Design a protein around this ligand. Structure first.
Ligand SMILES: COc1cc2c(cc1-c1c(C)noc1C)[nH]c1ccnc(-c3c(C4CC4)n[nH]c3C)c12
Length: 112
């Protein structure tokens, strides 16, 4: 059950990195570079940054013991985006689209 769940997690993350979703996924590929983007309030607002490359590294290191922990990091990544940015920002619209990709497939997680 757990190994199967973690293969589903790995599949979902590989899809989120696929070219077909890249026009909206790309801001989530790497950690937010606070200095490069001039976001001098980012760390005052976001206490736990997360991004897709960090999630990939944690899967590769077998840090997630089950799908719930993996899902919590994916949601943390999106929640940080919804917390920091104005609700009408282009990046929030991109987040909603990538989160729909994620939620619809994560809902199909094997359950036994
Ligand atoms: C505005 O939010 C981001 C922009 C970029 C990013 C992360 C975020 C981000 C996420 C996710 N959640 O919160 C924040 C903050 N990472 C990049 C790397 C390079 N350029 C860009 C870029 C963009 C992106 C289309 C939105 N607009 N203008 C530039 C300079 C970004």
């Amino acid at each position: 059950k757990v190994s199967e769940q973690l293969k589903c997690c790995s599949g979902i993350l590989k899809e989120m990195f696929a070219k077909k979703h890249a026009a909206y996924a790309w801001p989530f590929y790497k950690p937010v570079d606070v200095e490069a983007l001039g976001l001098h309030d980012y760390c005052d607002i976001i206490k736990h940054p997360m991004d897709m490359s960090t999630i990939k590294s944690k899967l590769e290191a077998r840090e997630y013991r089950d799908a719930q922990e993996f899902g919590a990091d994916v949601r943390l990544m999106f929640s940080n985006c919804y917390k920091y940015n104005p609700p009408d920002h282009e990046v929030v619209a991109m987040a909603r689209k990538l989160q729909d990709v994620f939620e619809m497939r994560f809902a199909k997680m094997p359950d036994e």
